[PDB]
Amino acid sequence: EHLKREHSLIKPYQGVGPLWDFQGSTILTSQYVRLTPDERSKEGSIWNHQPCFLKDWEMHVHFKVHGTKNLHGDGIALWYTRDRLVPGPVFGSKDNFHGLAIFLDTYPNDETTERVFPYISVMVNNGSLSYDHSKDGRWTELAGCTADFRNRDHDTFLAVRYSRGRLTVMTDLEDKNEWKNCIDITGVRLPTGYYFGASAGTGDLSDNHDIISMKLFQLMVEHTPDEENIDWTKIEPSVNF
Template identity: 50%
Template sequence: MTGKRVAAAVVCAYFFLVIAAQDDEPGYLKREHSLLKPYSGNGMSIPMWDFRDNVMITNNFIRLTQDHQGKRGSLWNRVPCFVRDWEFRVHFKVHGGGRSLAADGFALWYTKSRMEPGPVFGSRDEFTGFGLFLDTYKNGPQAVSFPFITGMINNGSVAYDHQTDGRKNSIGNCLATFRNKDYDTYISVRYVKQELTVSVDVDGKSEWKECFKVEGVLLPTGYFLGVSAATGDLADNHDILSMKLYEVEVERDPNDDGLELSSVIPQLKYPDRSKTSSDDAHRNTSMSGFKLFLLAFCGLLGLGVCLVVGFMIFQKHQERSRKRFY
């Protein structure tokens, strides 16, 4: 009887885990835009994906760059994505010999062109579409910790600003310590109803944490998904373990704007609403420090007043005592 109960408990636990895993999926998995094990087909080819430069394919991961200087690699879906609302989840690992310093990082792409190498994390500059950069090396003098995640919308005419690590044209960013972790690390890009949300799961808690969210993002259909990475004088291994694209089902207003999405120019409808999480955090930190200063100042001022008043009361008490004595 005990054995049957144990078996029943194991079966129930299994089904609960399956249900929980299913609940975590945001929509319908689009396999033509996803990369799952086993990666290779016949030979070194990957069905529905192309790669170039220093990419290395293994049974457990696809390495965009090795931990060597001056390397780059990219991996691109060869099927254009016509999904209107989607979520793109990437299981990755960035690791290397450098404990505190590494370079350069890797990027997630949803762009008009594909397989074009260049100076932006191994891919082309002045791209058309959306780029998300997981930067591990600080080029400019800005007072920001690294690794640093930042997003950029480009209509094909704007160059990535290396001096500010992309902050000049950033639509949102955040700090995320994802290097040299001994647990799984993930990043998610969700694009639903013209709202783009980037989230990370890099703390080993199996919980998504919002990096930034931007409303009014116009991205056309028919672009390509990809990832790329590069190393410089410093280096890291940039590994991709899986990439999953989900089609998200949403209810739409019958009076939808009817925008022809294939001809949309990538842009922000409300540039002033773009949210920069790290800037907000910096302002909040500065404000908190100011508040602490005010509290400390008021506390010291109050203490001083109390000491003065106390001393005056003590003096009067002493005078009265002397009068009574005489």
């Protein structure tokens, strides 16, 4: 009914099953995991070692993006995918992934966009989609919200809930200890047996991308008779039911 330690990244980040592995620019310190420094052309990631077999879960992420007018980037991505620790151009991680991505995009690559950044969005992939970095992934996203999470003078949190086809992302960015709406969609199909992870990238523009904690909660949810005769591990990630 509560916190799943084996799927949580918690300081001092010395968890042992080694519960998380890192690669690229990633460093561990006693107060945060820094995926990238504020230097150009960096890619870094951290990935849960144990595959998650919960159908119904909620991941809380305490993260921090910060640096030195409109000239910073590129953002963080939070993952729940079949493959782990594979570097790539998608905020540090492979493209054509299988599963779920939540992008915390801080830089408008699309030069004539009406969209206010930073922008949070979700993308579900069965390996057949490419993330168009140059268009901020707009043509492959399912939903998104504008989110003011960068350079705040207090803690910034995100909640990603997934249960029974329903994917919710909510924010806590204004120090009011309240969740605010961002994303709420249905007909999302994902398998169990995927891995949680997080990554960030910087290009010609940079920023510190830090994860302070990821806390995975197991939700107590009733399912239908029929639902339980599925091999939930072989479901193909899918959208629109």
